[PDB]
Amino acid sequence: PRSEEDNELNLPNLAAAYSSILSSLGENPQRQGLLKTPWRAASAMQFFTKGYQETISDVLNDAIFDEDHDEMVIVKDIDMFSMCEHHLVPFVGKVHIGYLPNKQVLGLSKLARIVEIYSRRLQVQERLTKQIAVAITEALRPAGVGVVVEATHMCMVMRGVQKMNSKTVTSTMLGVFREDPKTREEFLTLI
Amino acid sequence: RSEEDNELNLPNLAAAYSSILSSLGENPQRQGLLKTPWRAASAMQFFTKGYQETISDVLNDAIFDEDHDEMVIVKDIDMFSMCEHHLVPFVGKVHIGYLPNKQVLGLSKLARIVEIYSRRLQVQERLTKQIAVAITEALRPAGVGVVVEATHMCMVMRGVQKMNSKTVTSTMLGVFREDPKTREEFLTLIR
Amino acid sequence: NELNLPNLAAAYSSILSSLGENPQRQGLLKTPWRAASAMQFFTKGYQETISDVLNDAIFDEDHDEMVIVKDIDMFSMCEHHLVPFVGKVHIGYLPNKQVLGLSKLARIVEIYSRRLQVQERLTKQIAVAITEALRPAGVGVVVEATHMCMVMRGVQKMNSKTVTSTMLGVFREDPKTREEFLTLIR
Amino acid sequence: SEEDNELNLPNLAAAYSSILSSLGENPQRQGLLKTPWRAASAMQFFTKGYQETISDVLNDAIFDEDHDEMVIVKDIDMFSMCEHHLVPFVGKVHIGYLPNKQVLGLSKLARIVEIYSRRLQVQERLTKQIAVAITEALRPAGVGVVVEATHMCMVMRGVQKMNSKTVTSTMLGVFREDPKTREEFLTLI
Amino acid sequence: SEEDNELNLPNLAAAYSSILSSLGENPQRQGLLKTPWRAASAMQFFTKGYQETISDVLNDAIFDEDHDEMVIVKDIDMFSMCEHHLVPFVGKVHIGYLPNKQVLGLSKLARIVEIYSRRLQVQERLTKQIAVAITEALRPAGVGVVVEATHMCMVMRGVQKMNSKTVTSTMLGVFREDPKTREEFLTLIRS
Amino acid sequence: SEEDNELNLPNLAAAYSSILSSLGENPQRQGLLKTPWRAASAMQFFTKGYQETISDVLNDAIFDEDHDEMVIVKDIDMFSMCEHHLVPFVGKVHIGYLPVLGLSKLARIVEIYSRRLQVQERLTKQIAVAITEALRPAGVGVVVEATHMCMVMRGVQKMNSKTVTSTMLGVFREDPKTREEFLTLIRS
Amino acid sequence: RSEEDNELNLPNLAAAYSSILSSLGENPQRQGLLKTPWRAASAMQFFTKGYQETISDVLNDAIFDEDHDEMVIVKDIDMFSMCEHHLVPFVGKVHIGYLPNKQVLGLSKLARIVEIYSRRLQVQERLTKQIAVAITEALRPAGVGVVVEATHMCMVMRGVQKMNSKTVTSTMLGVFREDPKTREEFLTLI
Amino acid sequence: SEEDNELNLPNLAAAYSSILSSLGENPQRQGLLKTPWRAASAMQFFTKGYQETISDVLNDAIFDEDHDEMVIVKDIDMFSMCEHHLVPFVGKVHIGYLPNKQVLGLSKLARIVEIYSRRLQVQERLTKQIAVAITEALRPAGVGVVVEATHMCMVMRGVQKMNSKTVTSTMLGVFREDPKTREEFLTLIRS
Amino acid sequence: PRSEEDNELNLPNLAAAYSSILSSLGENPQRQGLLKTPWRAASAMQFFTKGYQETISDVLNDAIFDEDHDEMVIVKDIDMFSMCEHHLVPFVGKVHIGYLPNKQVLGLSKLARIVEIYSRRLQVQERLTKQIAVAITEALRPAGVGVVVEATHMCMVMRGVQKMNSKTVTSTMLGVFREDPKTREEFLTLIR
Amino acid sequence: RSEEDNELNLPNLAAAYSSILSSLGENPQRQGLLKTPWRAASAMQFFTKGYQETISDVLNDAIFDEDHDEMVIVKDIDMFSMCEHHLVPFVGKVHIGYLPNKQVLGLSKLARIVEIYSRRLQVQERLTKQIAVAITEALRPAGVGVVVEATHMCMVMRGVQKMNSKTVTSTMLGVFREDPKTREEFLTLI
Ligand SMILES: Nc1nc2c(ccn2[C@@H]2O[C@H](COP(=O)(O)OP(=O)(O)OP(=O)(O)O)[C@@H](O)[C@H]2O)c(=O)[nH]1
Ligand SMILES: Nc1nc2c(ccn2[C@@H]2O[C@H](COP(=O)(O)OP(=O)(O)OP(=O)(O)O)[C@@H](O)[C@H]2O)c(=O)[nH]1
Ligand SMILES: Nc1nc2c(ccn2[C@@H]2O[C@H](COP(=O)(O)OP(=O)(O)OP(=O)(O)O)[C@@H](O)[C@H]2O)c(=O)[nH]1
Ligand SMILES: Nc1nc2c(ccn2[C@@H]2O[C@H](COP(=O)(O)OP(=O)(O)OP(=O)(O)O)[C@@H](O)[C@H]2O)c(=O)[nH]1
Ligand SMILES: [Zn+2]
Ligand SMILES: [Zn+2]
Ligand SMILES: [Zn+2]
Ligand SMILES: [Zn+2]
Ligand SMILES: [Zn+2]
Ligand SMILES: [Zn+2]
Ligand SMILES: [Zn+2]
Ligand SMILES: [Zn+2]
Ligand SMILES: [Zn+2]
Ligand SMILES: [Zn+2]
């Protein structure tokens, strides 16, 4: 995984590349508004890709509780901010997660923290959706998991096709959410 | 800026984007990243295409004599710009109003003037002033009012991480600045 | 109209051929005629006169307060590209004792909207027609429209809306009358 | 192609000038002077779709993401032209598909909409054409396309029904054969 | 009077039966058998305001509450009949008044609306009649009445404009003479 | 017919004049002077549908588009007249069918039956049967949602009450999944 | 109940309301409370007017032969009732659906049946069942579905004080009870 | 004051039992058995404001925060009883005040609403009482109170006007004398 | 169960701990705004945990009627205010309850009062949801019970993940609500 | 406040929270409460992190010369604070407007100034004033306007228990206070 030492070491290389981009765009990197931009853009890009340095074990912090619960738990409307790996422009939206506990429940915030491990990377929405579902499955081993991601890709609104209102909806269903249609429909209506 | 400048600077932009991918700990050779230095460079060139535009070419002599001396408004113009401090988008709406001096501007040219200045590395306050000044210079009307409302992704997906924050800026010239009733009317007609 | 119909159909058939289309296809067989009839309907306002439209609908109701007819659906044609511009018209007026038939305000909108237009002109024409037909203390007309030339083409700005207004008499000279009208139409 | 456009532009402008005269208008007045040309260029833009090929539009944007679950791109703004009256019909396209391991690049679904919407159309045909284009480009497990549109021919003339909306759909593969897949797509849009 | 209603009911039923025959319909079919009577009774109910007097409606509901501030009763559902085509016009009435120490019973404002709306009307007349009735019944510092209505003569026939709404108003006393009182009333009703 | 309309307009106007007098009103006052004729013309317009035939309305607008999937035209504004009280009932019509008819013809079929003295249940069935007879499709579904002014401005005086009626023919009646797909696609 | 019963019981109702005003520490002689024993008694008599009604008189023979065998719904019927436990209102909407057996009922008569039972001292569950049973007895249709959604003021301005709380009750008879597809179609259409 | 409730409870229950008999009901049926007592307790709760004093309610919650600017507590749910029919009238209270350096604890504005709303009322009186109680408890530069309510006497009986809402207001001090203060308060209370 | 004597005895222990918190945060417990805070915070925490002091029997008050009702009764949008047991920060939302009476019906307000027994405690949402459904099944013995809780956890919005719009939805289905899918879907659509 | 103060005071906060769990009648040894004294103490430190912040460090020299003399507004800034009277949150939105004196501030610094004062034990009126004064001192503009709209949980989940009540406070400095037209323009734009 990526480290804070890797971030400090790579920051001047990122700043050098951003300064080179400003010059290549016809801009003056010495004007007041651009003076600190190579560094602020480099730090922003490091923050946008901070998920690479995260591990599921550290994120969970042993937040698995024995609540004798065998019914669907949903955490919906998790704000998600990711980066398109094809154009390096953001894609933002919401993540809705549902799961069937096998007696043990995961701490509610850990579902949002798992979203943050994978969303803070250079992504493709389909991959991001699958990774979240698989992480929950491996961390807790529940009866089933369901993940739905709804996002606006800025590559499709401020450029290219320039379709203003287009939204991409992806889903990943594991266990009972995949095998039992009634579980799957209940999750989709509750979100 | 020119199209020759774009062709010449494209490989330098692609080189800097490839360097960024390596500095972030990513593999520039994986399927999803193979064409990214080029697609990211082309996207950044499109986002900064306003530098190569001139008001005269954009207007195309669209000034008509309609014996009109009353406020004309073009509201809800979708605007997509790039924060010059972090190189992350800031997007929103532009609302333009003007009092013609017998002659009217072609409706679309107001949105095209927005595109000259929004497709640049910007600060919202500057973008707002530039649009109002361009309209005043192109038409010489009794007055111009420009209101920009935008979401800065630098404030939502990083830093302060304030989800719902919106920045509202305005520039009032001529009668819109000197006459309070004119400014009061424009502001009500745009909501 | 009857004499012009075959000339319009001939021009529309010529357009179909110039676009690379087969004017003989089942779907395009009656298109030169349906397109010509549609364009005649879209421009029917040229053949209308204010006097015939009013039909003597002026009533003596001893009214000296603002009457508003808002949300009148308006469908016009951009004279620059020949593509529609559609929206709403909001009309207000201050009668001079005599009130006008409510539908006649919408019928005045139809005289000028069913023409090749520019929104600023259309707005002025409606206000002037009301002033000439009734001679009231004042008239106010607000038009809010979507120009398809700006949404399906050119700038391709999906949510842009154009707002125009024409204030005559008391609506122009008295700011309080003007602001009351603007709040009552929202 | 672009060569055909330049050659046919003066013939389109001549026909539009003829229309202005036949409507009782003055083609020499300020507002109408450039109209035969602007109207001809607009009609050529509205009919771009004819000169486009699926292969060029896709640009090899097919990625191996080991995905076998429904992908939806909804609320794609669509602007088309009624072939019966030559008046626009505008709305939204909602596309869903069940990939077979490989995923098409999201924008290419919106670009496929543009190939067939920028033509003289009938909504039912446009709906089928998008669904078929996706099936042919990707060969997925299934495709679902829903188009919801306002026909200006029904709002500004004829029946003059202001609020009427036409909803069409085309379901191929698993979207047609499996009722549960089809209902899931319809609720997610 | 109720004596006038009993006496005129068979004449109304005879005219409605005559209408059914003149429209090409069969007045003897099951659906139309009782229609001349049900239509006549409905028309008598729609015009019941003619048999009402302000004094009877008021029922001495004037209380001494030492109140000199604006009282508003808004969103009063109003159903009237167009006198030009005999088709309904329906909407809302918003009434405001500045008491002169004495306050009218809230329901009596709606009952005054019913005296004038249940008649063959013109919206401008109906608005004035309500304001004048309140001024005569109470003698307050001022009265304001705003009527917003959909005329079915404009939606299901003639111009056939579906969304058109007619807004009329009558301001008496302080509501007419003091602009600030008038604007306060207009903002408090636009809920 | 139009000759029937010219012959019956004076009688309608005399019956309306008689109504104005029987209500205690003055048919000689300015507001009422032209009302007998204008109310008569309005009632004729509201009952226009009886003079219309499906064949004339269709205008041969049947196209071969090789379509076997559901086509829906929803939110068609409908204005009808209650046959029990002669007061309007207004709302929306949502039509679905499995083929190809010209889209506007569905709204024109609504106008044939809505412009008559009606009962909502009858109006709904007539629209569905007219489409089935004109096209012979796999199935038709018609949903009418209306406000009856007889129930809001008089009688029970229930302000927000709405009546929903439906008619399902062919596959829309026999196949549960086709009817449930149509019912979800008409929700706006 | 009858109108003669209302004239006879009116002074006893007014006496009880006057007694309530005195027991609350109020002055029944002050301007605002002077006519209150009578206006409160008349209001309570109007709120309980459903006791003096009969299904047969309210239907007024409004049964038409329209050859209809498909679902008819009258939704959003405003309903105002009185809680029999605290004598405080419970108000909301009634949504009625039915599958005719060729014959249709007059639209307003469904709302009039709601008025027979809502204008009484009630419990929402009883009110819901009574409306469904009255329609079944008046029409004998294939099935009836009734859904009542109400705000009980006893739960918002007093007691538990949960002001967004809404009670939803339902009664399904015939095909609405036995056929799940009929039941779900009715619930989505309302 | 609490002793008055225990002493008067059997007299209230006797009057409610008498009402049940006079309505033609059986006071001995299961649903009506505890009703004379539950109705009496409910009426005592609805009129509990009579036993409250401003001094006890305030609990010395006056803080010195050097504040001289408008403080607003809007959307206070209010439940009162119509003194004419003994049927509820419910709505919202929006209070504004200009402090004279000292600020009242926010909750005490809602508690002042409860002193006067829990009584047999007239909306105009209730509005004035709240404003006068605040003016007396703090002696601020000015007070503004707006009450918006639905009278059940007007919806489930009498005029039977479903959507009618009564809006009353009381402005004291600067809120009454300064029009700009008054309009600022009225705009800030719109939600 | 907790008692009023327990509350009086522990109130000065709670104020002492709150006063200690004010000092440990670097604040001045003697400034005007903080002077009564140890007591007001202690009383508030006692109110937030009053459900421990309550028993189902006292709460019901014999409001179990004998109607002839065998159809679904729903009480939805019950405002619920609870306290996260992990951080001692509120979690607030709505509770929607549905049940199938076995002829006997419960008093409507008692469903909301059962919500109050368990929500006014240091909780976990999944536990709170189950306790409400189990209390209803034990008090009434109906054909089935369904409970849905939708809440905003302030630990998730004003700190930690800081996800502004995140909502947690939990459910507990007993009897016919668990075993019959049609009953379950009807309840879920009627609560929207 | 400092990071050393936080490390030193964390065990004292945990001790007080453990003492609160015992005083409420709870079992501090049960699974769900075992780490609570520490998680509650860390949460309270985070809620009060504003005490360790200085306007100078927060600004980071983000003052730009953009020749701007017109109103800049940053609205809908989500704000989370703590009631100093009950130690229960009060949350809402902050809307800030200012008239620059040629120099503009970095947009995010307005939200960061909100965070200095909201992350403390507060009173809404003080929070609003502190926010407007910090902007005036940092930039010296022509005027500043701050509006705070909040839900106090002390008033919704306890005490008066008024569900929908919202507190609106404002602070206007400079031209926002002295020019009524500037003040009204700001209030409509937010
Ligand atoms: N007036 C104005 N301000 C603008 C933009 C665009 C950006 N900015 C603002 O420039 C500042 C740069 O600050 P900095 O050097 O401290 O960076 P950094 O530590 O990464 O900051 P932060 O984001 O707080 O983490 C920020 O305050 C940012 O918001 C605009 O349009 N108008
Ligand atoms: N199925 C159906 N029913 C319809 C219409 C239109 C109307 N009706 C209903 O005929 C009944 C006639 O009753 P009646 O003779 O007793 O009239 P009247 O005393 O004035 O009654 P009311 O209105 O209660 O005061 C009413 O119930 C009315 O609603 C329709 O479309 N479909
Ligand atoms: N200003 C004011 N007025 C109020 C209340 C509360 C009630 N009222 C009004 O007292 C009047 C009592 O009249 P009355 O004697 O004629 O009764 P009744 O025949 O049953 O009447 P009605 O209702 O028409 O059937 C009504 O007008 C009612 O609205 C309030 O808060 N402020
Ligand atoms: N199923 C059903 N139940 C109904 C009504 C109407 C009321 N009720 C419920 O009877 C119960 C009475 O209990 P009780 O004797 O203890 O009274 P009281 O202490 O004042 O109660 P509370 O309000 O908690 O303070 C309450 O639960 C009430 O809501 C209905 O329509 N259906
Ligand atoms: Zn991209
Ligand atoms: Zn930035
Ligand atoms: Zn154009
Ligand atoms: Zn067409
Ligand atoms: Zn009319
Ligand atoms: Zn009727
Ligand atoms: Zn009750
Ligand atoms: Zn009353
Ligand atoms: Zn927590
Ligand atoms: Zn507090």
Author numbering:
A (entry chain C): 58 to 248
B (entry chain D): 59 to 249
C (entry chain T): 64 to 249
D (entry chain P): 60 to 248
E (entry chain R), H (entry chain O): 60 to 250
F (entry chain S): 60 to 158, 162 to 250
G (entry chain Q), J (entry chain B): 59 to 248
I (entry chain A): 58 to 249
Kindly provide excerpts from the paper associated with this entry.
Guanosine triphosphate (GTP) cyclohydrolase I (GCH1) (EC:3.5.4.16) catalyzes the conversion of GTP to dihydroneopterin triphosphate (H2NTP). This reaction is the first and rate-limiting step involved in the de novo synthesis of tetrahydrobiopterin (BH4). The effects of GFRP on GCH1 occur via formation of heteromeric protein complexes between GCH1 and GFRP, which are dependent on the intracellular concentrations of the effector molecules phenylalanine or BH4. GCH1−GFRP complexes consist of one GCH1 decamer flanked by two pentameric GFRP complexes.
We determined structures of the human GCH1 in the absence (xtal_GCH1) and presence (xtal_GCH1+active) of the substrate analog 7-deaza-GTP and in the presence of the allosteric inhibitor cpd-1 (xtal_GCH1+allosteric and xtal_GCH1+allosteric). The same degree of disorder seen for the inhibitory cryo-EM structure was observed for the xtal_GCH1_allosteric structure, while region A is ordered and F122 is in a defined closed state in xtal_GCH1+active. The most obvious conformational change upon substrate binding occurs in region A. The partial disorder of the residue range 115 to 130 is resolved into a well-defined loop structure closing the upper ceiling of the active site pocket. This disorder−order transition is clearly seen in both the cryo-EM maps and the X-ray structures. Further, region B involving the triphosphate binding pharmacophore becomes ordered. R216 is part of this region and, in substrate analog complexed states, coordinates the β- and γ-phosphate of GTP variants and contributes to the charge compensation of the triphosphate moiety. Locking the R216 side chain in the presence of triphosphate ligands thus leads to a stabilization of a preferred conformation of this loop. Finally, upon binding of 7-deaza-GTP, changes in region C, including positioning of the five-helix bundle and curvature of the β-barrel, are observed. Here, region C bends outward, toward the active site, and the protein inside expands in comparison to the apo structure. This movement is opposite to the observed conformational change in the inhibitory complex.
